[PDB]
Amino acid sequence: KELSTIQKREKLNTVERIGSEGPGGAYHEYVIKSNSMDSQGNYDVYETIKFQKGARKEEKSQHGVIDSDLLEIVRDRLKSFQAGPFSSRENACALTHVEEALMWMNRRVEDRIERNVL
Amino acid sequence: MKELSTIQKREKLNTVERIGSEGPGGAYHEYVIKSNSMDSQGNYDVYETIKFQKGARKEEKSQHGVIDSDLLEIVRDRLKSFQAGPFSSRENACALTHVEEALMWMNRRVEDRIER
Numbered sequence A: 001k002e003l004s005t006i007q008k009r010e011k012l013n014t015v016e017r018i019g020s021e022g023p024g025g026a027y028h029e030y031v032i033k034s035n036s037m038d039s040q041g042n043y044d045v046y047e048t049i050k051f052q053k054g055a056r057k058e059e060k061s062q063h064g065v066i067d068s069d070l071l072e073i074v075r076d077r078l079k080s081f082q083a084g085p086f087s088s089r090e091n092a093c094a095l096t097h098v099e100e101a102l103m104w105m106n107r108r109v110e111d112r113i114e115r116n117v118l
Numbered sequence B: 001m002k003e004l005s006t007i008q009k010r011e012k013l014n015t016v017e018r019i020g021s022e023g024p025g026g027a028y029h030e031y032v033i034k035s036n037s038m039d040s041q042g043n044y045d046v047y048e049t050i051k052f053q054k055g056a057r058k059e060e061k062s063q064h065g066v067i068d069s070d071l072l073e074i075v076r077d078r079l080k081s082f083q084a085g086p087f088s089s090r091e092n093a094c095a096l097t098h099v100e101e102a103l104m105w106m107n108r109r110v111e112d113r114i115e116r
Helices: A067-083 A089-117 B068-084 B090-115
Strands: A013-017 A029-034 A046-050 B014-018 B030-035 B047-051
Touching: A013 B068, A029 B068, A046 B047, A067 A089, A067 B014, A067 B030, A067 B068, A089 B090, B068 B090
Parallel strands: none
Antiparallel strands: A013 A029, A029 A046, B014 B030, B030 B047
């Protein structure tokens, strides 16, 4: 259930899926946890991320984040890094790719909105 | 304003907001994802805080948390599942490739630091 990541060496955290497959075959809960233990033996980092699973207006749905929410956080951090003294060509390419991913994901949302008004 | 200007403008489910101050590099290290909807008592349907690693993991004074590639790996895995199921689309195939190339560019900064 643990993710095989692009980065292979000196990973601060691991990522794993929680639960089963839901709508579209996707997992809707993830855990980011550290590979480091503190003095007591607990995780230095343990963070859960629950995704929206169904329409927000339906009270029976699981309410949570969506994927563009996560990319927008990373987009904002890469923009702050690129405007600061630590800017680099690597993070400029990563920023451009993150934004083009965000733009592709918004295509279906906008098309669906245009269909619903008509 | 702490609220983010996102690529999506209409029918946004959640608002993303910067928490705290700028730190290393001028970047914020804590974010809140909160719903644009509430119950009758004023409670947010969604209120998720995301803390980023600030400072070396080996230092006890540092803020321990997630890193950016962790969040992209989650989105990467989601898009891979969606692309294997009934919601597969050319749009998500393009978004997936862009997400993985962003991840590869970030890893290049890491592998270069390992060498140096």
